[PDB]
Amino acid sequence: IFKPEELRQALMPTLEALYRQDPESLPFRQPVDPQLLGIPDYFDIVKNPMDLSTIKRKLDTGQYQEPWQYVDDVWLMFNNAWLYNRKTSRVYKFCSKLAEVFEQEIDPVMQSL
Ligand SMILES: C[C@@H]1CC(=O)Nc2ccccc2N1
C-alpha cells in the first residue's frame, strides 16, 4: 500500500516545519543523553526516547511502513517532554509550540494519504 519514497515525500514537510521552529525545536534536535545532560533519572521516567534526528533518520531509511507509525513517534517525543518537565519550563513550553505546529500540519497530510 505505501511506497517508501512517496511516504517520505508526503510526511517530510511536516517534520521540516518542526525543524523550522527556532528556538522551539532546539531541545528536540538531538537524542537526550542523560549522563551528559546532568539529568540521570531521565531513562527511569522516559522508557522510549525519541527526538527529531531519530524521526528524520527513520523517515529517510524506510523504517515507517505506514503513516501512523511516524505520527506515533512524533507524539512519543512530545509526550516524553510533557511527562518529564515542569509545565512552565522552557522544554515543556517549546514542546507545546512544536505540537501546535504539528497538529496544524499533519491533519490534511494524513487525510490525503
Ligand atoms: C528534551 C530534552 C530532555 C528533557 O525532556 N528535558 C530536559 C531537561 C534538561 C535538559 C535538557 C532537556 N531536554
| DSSP per-residue string spanning 38-106 | T-TTHHHH-SS---HHHHHHHHHTT--SSHHHHHHHHHHHHHHHHHHS-TTSHHHHHHHHHHHHHHHHH
Lookup: cell for 107: 491533519
Q: Resolution of the deposited coordinates, in angstroms?
A: 1.6
Q: What domain range includes position 112?
A: 1-113
Q: What is the SS3 assignment for 113?
A: coil
Measure 24 CA to ligand 1 centroid, in angstroms. Answer: 12
Say yes or no: CB of residue 81 within 6 Å of ligand 1: yes
Residue nearest (by alpha carbon) to ligand 1 atom 1: 27
CA of 82 to the centre of ligand 1 (A): 10
* Nearby residues of 44 by Cβ (< 8 Å), 6 or more positions away: none
Count of domains forming the chain: 1
Q: What is the CATH number of the domain that holds 57?
A: 1.20.920.10
**Nearest 5°: phi and psi at 33?**
-110, 105
Q: Report CA(91)–ligand 1 centroid distance (Å).
A: 6
84 CB less than 6 Å from ligand 1? Answer: yes
Task: Give the distance (Å) from ligand 1 centre to CA of residue 80.
Answer: 10
